[PDB]
Symmetry: none
């Protein structure tokens, strides 16, 4: 099992492109903030989660998203070795809601 459902606000301009092999992809960052109850305590959960929406199916849906847009994404997480060398945890969207 690998399923993450996360809501947040797009905090970085959506980078749209198509792979040299014809794969449409949209990348952006999702900023999440919430109050969480853990072991009886109230703590804040926060993260700026990189999100990638690949494939023709979800490309149109993203057109409505820009910096400031609030969305809820469902997909799987996976780690990637960025150019910075460090490891980058990113959410591969399978589903996206615009409100």
């Amino acid at each position: 099992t690998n399923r993450l459902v996360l809501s947040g606000t797009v905090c970085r301009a959506p980078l749209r492109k198509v792979s040299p092999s014809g794969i449409p992809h949209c990348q952006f960052v999702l900023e999440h903030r919430s109050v969480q109850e853990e072991a009886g305590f109230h703590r804040q959960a926060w993260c700026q989660m990189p999100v990638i929406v690949s494939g023709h199916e979800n490309q149109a849906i993203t057109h409505s998203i820009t910096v400031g847009s609030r969305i809820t994404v469902q997909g799987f997480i996976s780690c990637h070795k960025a150019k910075n060398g460090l490891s980058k945890m990113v959410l591969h969207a399978e589903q996206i809601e615009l409100i």
Copy 2:
């Protein structure tokens, strides 16, 4: 007379600073979108208006603002020589309602 009342969604994270004398400054960008009536016509009004909130009494609500926050700002407009050529217009907040 100089008074602008503009609503929108913060499209750029607030930048905070304190001048040498101690006056706090909070700057962000407000993106506005709406359909207006001009003598009887469609007209899609849009702009990304820079906003600065200066001074002690007014900085509090500022911390409750983040990218995606929906707000309405009331203040005066003024132009500052940006970096390029012509000046850049800024909305100097006098009142801010978190929505």
Copy 3:
């Protein structure tokens, strides 16, 4: 909400045009000068605001405005691409008052 009320002295004469359908409209630049308040102290405010006046039933009051005319314009603002290719703030006049 999108409402700006701005007083000033016209610094660029009205340029008149007729839309493809016959609707008259003109544009001039309004130079605003004032002293406002910020952080508990006076702050200078200035801007040369482009103003568009559209519609048959609104051109009348503009025939009296020329360079040096002092007026107050009420309307909504929007961003348009200048020839330069740079975005420029413009006040679409809804109401105009002389002197």
Copy 4:
């Protein structure tokens, strides 16, 4: 006992309807935001309350309400089932103060 007095800003443009029976109603959403003392602490109270104004005689007090109108609504609350399936709280307005 069922009375709610709530100040706020109309965050949803009014939707006007006429039921098949001929009864009119005006629906909108009132966004409230305030600080309330509680247990020795100042807490932020917030909500987007759906408001319904029903009947011919109650429509007049809604002529001026638009997004941005700041008003205080007094009425009673009741729970209705929304088309999404969930049951939401609604404030049936009896009085509306136009704070201007």
